Amino acid sequence: IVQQQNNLLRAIEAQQHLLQLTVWGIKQLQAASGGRGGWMEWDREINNYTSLIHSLIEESQ
Amino acid sequence: IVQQQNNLLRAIEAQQHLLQLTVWGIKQLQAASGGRGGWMEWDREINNYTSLIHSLIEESQ
Amino acid sequence: IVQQQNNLLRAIEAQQHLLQLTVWGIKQLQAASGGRGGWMEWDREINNYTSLIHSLIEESQ
Lengths: 61, 61, 61
What we know:
Shape of chain A: elongated
PDB class: viral protein
Helix content of chain A: over 70%
Keywords: GP41, HIV-1, membrane fusion, HIV-1 inhibition, Viral protein
Largest interface: A-B, 27 and 20 residues
Assembly: trimeric
Chains A, B, C: transmembrane glycoprotein (GP41)
Entry title: HIV-1 GP41 core
Oligomer: homotrimer
CATH class of chain A: Mainly Alpha
């Protein structure tokens, strides 16, 4: 069970890397059209959930 | 083990919020270029997987 | 505990499908603006993390 929980945590960590890659990609597309001022709340929400996930990953370890 | 499974579920729940934020962001970029009629299947697939995840999160709880 | 670990793995598998749908969506938006040559590293990183996740999902099973 312990070994399996470590595997699941590893999957979650890798999916978080993928999530951040998609966020970065979306930001570049947004920047290509103009200033990103209108996405400041979207950015804040993303930053907040990322902080939450970081805390959970740290705690799981 | 129980406490750890709760933590993993919490991480998955937060990553789901992040996923929905990226979906919303992509939809706004799509809408900026024109009607989203061509993304109706993509929307259906996303809605379906989100339903699946919601069920699993509900079951895990 | 075993039943619960299976549920978490299922959630991770469904979220991976969602991640791939967002990646595909981003690629179409990128392609709409021109060639995707500048995203070859982004593609490589995404492909690599996806490979990692596939391995972890296979191992978890």
